[PDB]
Amino acid sequence: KVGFFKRQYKEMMEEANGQIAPENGTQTPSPPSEK
């Protein structure tokens, strides 16, 4: 159980992050270098 989340977790995160709203990119799991 790892190769599923890689495409499932990212899909569930982008859909709830604002897949249709401007939120997409505001709460995104940015890297430590930027966060």
Swiss-Prot record:
Predominantly expressed in monocytes and granulocytes. A motif (GFFKR motif) lies at residues 3-7. Residues 1-35 are cytoplasmic. It comes from the Eukaryota. It is found in: Membrane. Heterodimer of an alpha and a beta subunit. Alpha-X associates with beta-2. The integrin I-domain (insert) is a VWFA domain. Integrins with I-domains do not undergo protease cleavage. Integrin alpha-X/beta-2 is a receptor for fibrinogen. It recognizes the sequence G-P-R in fibrinogen. It mediates cell-cell interaction during inflammatory responses. It is especially important in monocyte adhesion and chemotaxis. Belongs to the integrin alpha chain family. This is Integrin alpha-X. The chain holds residues 1129 to 1163 of 1163 of the full protein.
